[PDB]
């Protein structure tokens, strides 16, 4: 994560293995336009939701 204001231009990084993952039994680079729908979990993008 970083700030790019030229002056306030610091940053931070953390070691964290973040390999691609794929719900289901088939490796898929991108969700296929068509196919089966299976129960999966995602981070709800709604800022109000509480984890």
């Amino acid at each position: 994560v970083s700030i790019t204001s030229g002056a306030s231009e610091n940053s931070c990084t953390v070691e964290k293995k973040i390999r691609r993952k794929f719900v289901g039994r088939e490796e898929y680079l991108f969700p296929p336009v068509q196919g089966k729908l299976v129960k999966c979990h995602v981070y709800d993008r709604l800022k109000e939701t509480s984890a």
Partner: protein, 78 residues
């Protein structure tokens, strides 16, 4: 009945994507796609009649009335 999408079934007799209930499109034969969720009635392509009714923005001041208040034909508003 039990179904693969784990999402609501309407009077169409099929399980259907519940997110389509506020996708801007009526998919079920019933007008369920606007019953249980918050919606932008107007996209940036749409004209708000001053009552909050929404119509394609091209319908505004185009020749004929569209919304229940005629704002889509208001001269001053054109």
């Amino acid at each position: 009945a039990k179904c693969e999408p784990s999402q609501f079934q309407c009077t169409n007799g099929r399980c259907i994507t519940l997110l389509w209930k506020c996708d801007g499109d009526e998919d079920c034969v019933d007008g369920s796609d606007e019953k249980n969720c918050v919606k932008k009635t107007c996209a940036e392509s749409d004209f708000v009649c001053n009552n909050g009714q929404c119509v394609p923005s091209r319908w505004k001041c185009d020749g004929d009335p569209d919304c229940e208040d005629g704002s889509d034909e208001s001269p001053e508003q054109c």
